[PDB]
Amino acid sequence: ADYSVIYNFAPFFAFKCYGVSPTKLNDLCFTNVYADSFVIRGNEVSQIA
Amino acid sequence: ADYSVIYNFAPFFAFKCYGVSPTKLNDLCFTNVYADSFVIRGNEVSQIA
Ligand SMILES: *[C@@H]1O[C@H](CO)[C@@H](O)[C@H](O)[C@H]1NC(C)=O
Numbered sequence: 001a002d003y004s005v006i007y008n009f010a011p012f013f014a015f016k017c018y019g020v021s022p023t024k025l026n027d028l029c030f031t032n033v034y035a036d037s038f039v040i041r042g043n044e045v046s047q048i049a
Numbered sequence: 050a051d052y053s054v055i056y057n058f059a060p061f062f063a064f065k066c067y068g069v070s071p072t073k074l075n076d077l078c079f080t081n082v083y084a085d086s087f088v089i090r091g092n093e094v095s096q097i098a
Contacts, residue, residue, distance in 0.1 A: 007092050014095045 001033070002026070050082070051075070 003025040015022040040048075052074040064071040089097070 011091075013092055 003022075017025075020028070052071075066074075069077065
């Protein structure tokens with residue numbers, strides 16, 4: 001997993017991580033990763049938390 | 050030093066201060082001030098910390 005290339009795919013501003021830090025994702029080793037994708041409204045982004 | 054005129058020079062939103070507060074900068078008296086200027090990408094601003 002190379003998390004330093006994600007910035008080259010989408011025009012977002014910054015991550016928002018809860019249990020870890022965005023800069024420390026290149027050192028830890030996990031068991032499985034899951035990715036969920038969808039489209040919502042502008043003011044409903046704060047509800048994903 | 051008058052830090053209330055800085056808002057009239059650049060179209061930024063707000064300060065981001067770490068050791069002090071932006072509203073209390075008119076009272077303290079320092080020894081020297083340094084200013085560094087450059088241009089970076091949009092998503093690399095969060096790395097200046
Ligand atoms: C720096 O500040 C103004 C904005 O108030 C800018 O338009 C201009 O390039 C500079 N000021 C002058 C007098 O040139």
